[PDB]
Amino acid sequence: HHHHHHMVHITLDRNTANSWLIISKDRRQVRMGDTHQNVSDNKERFSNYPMVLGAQRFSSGKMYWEVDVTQKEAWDLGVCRDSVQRKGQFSLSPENGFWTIWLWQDSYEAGTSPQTTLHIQVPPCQIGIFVDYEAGVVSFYNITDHGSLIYTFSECVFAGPLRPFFNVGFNYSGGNAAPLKLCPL
Ligand SMILES: CC(=O)NCCc1ccccc1C
């Protein structure tokens, strides 16, 4: 792909983070802590899952960023509406305001309803995410495999400002402690 020139500098919004997450000083990396991280609760924090939003809000244009997922067993990545539900149980779907892919139990799936099987021959260490607001497109690229397409959501009905979306996943196995990292331009 040739989307690299729409690169945007994404930073994580502490205030949206699940209370167990640890965000680096530069706001570019996030990982699951072993316990509650000693912050007060607020209506923005994701309660049920280890999720956090980027600070940036997009309502027009073309945006591109990259995320490092090296040695993780489980994660969700993409974009969501600024007004997605924060508390309780919910599914990642466009009906609920999410345009995402994930890794879970050695398979990759797109967050459609119901979910769609992805066909990945080279497990990615870094994912590229492209959003075209006007066209209603969210695309995912395998940076490890020369930028090969993973999945395109088209005819997206964003219905609001968009925010970058992250889930570091649980670490019940002891094999999923590694961080998500926003990769430099
Ligand atoms: C997964 C696990 O066993 N967590 C341990 C967290 C804990 C609890 C009580 C005292 C000290 C620690 C580190």
Curated annotation (Swiss-Prot):
Protein name: E3 ubiquitin-protein ligase TRIM21
Domain of life: Eukaryota
Record comment regarding domains: The coiled-coil is necessary for the cytoplasmic localization. The RING-type zinc finger is necessary for ubiquitination and for the IRF3-driven interferon beta promoter activity. Interacts with SKP2 and CUL1 in a RING finger-independent manner. The RING-type zinc finger is necessary for ubiquitination of NMI.
Induction trigger: Up-regulated by IFN.
Task of the protein: E3 ubiquitin-protein ligase whose activity is dependent on E2 enzymes, UBE2D1, UBE2D2, UBE2E1 and UBE2E2. Forms a ubiquitin ligase complex in cooperation with the E2 UBE2D2 that is used not only for the ubiquitination of USP4 and IKBKB but also for its self-ubiquitination. Component of cullin-RING-based SCF (SKP1-CUL1-F-box protein) E3 ubiquitin-protein ligase complexes such as SCF(SKP2)-like complexes. A TRIM21-containing SCF(SKP2)-like complex is shown to mediate ubiquitination of CDKN1B ('Thr-187' phosphorylated-form), thereby promoting its degradation by the proteasome.
UniProt PTM: Autoubiquitinated; does not lead to its proteasomal degradation. Deubiquitinated by USP4; leading to its stabilization. Autoubiquitinated.
Domain B30.2/SPRY: 8-185
Family: Belongs to the TRIM/RBCC family.
Intracellular or extracellular location(s): Cytoplasm; Cytoplasmic vesicle, Autophagosome; Nucleus; Cytoplasm, P-body
Subunit structure, as described in the record: Homotrimer. Component of a SCF(SKP2)-like complex containing CUL1, SKP1, TRIM21 and SKP2. Interacts with CALR, CUL1, FBXW11, HSPA5, IKBKB, IRF3, SKP1 and VCP. Interacts with SKP2; the interaction with SKP2 does not depend on an intact F-box domain. Interacts (via N-terminus and C-terminus) with DCP2 (via N-terminus and C-terminus). Interacts (via C-terminus) with IRF8 (via C-terminus). Interacts with ULK1, BECN1 and with ATG8 family members, including GABARAP, GABARAPL1, GABARAPL2 and MAP1LC3C/LC3C. Interacts with TRIM21 and SQSTM1/sequestosome 1. Interacts with IRF3.
Source organism (scientific name): Mus musculus (Mouse)
Lineage: Eukaryota, Metazoa, Chordata, Craniata, Vertebrata
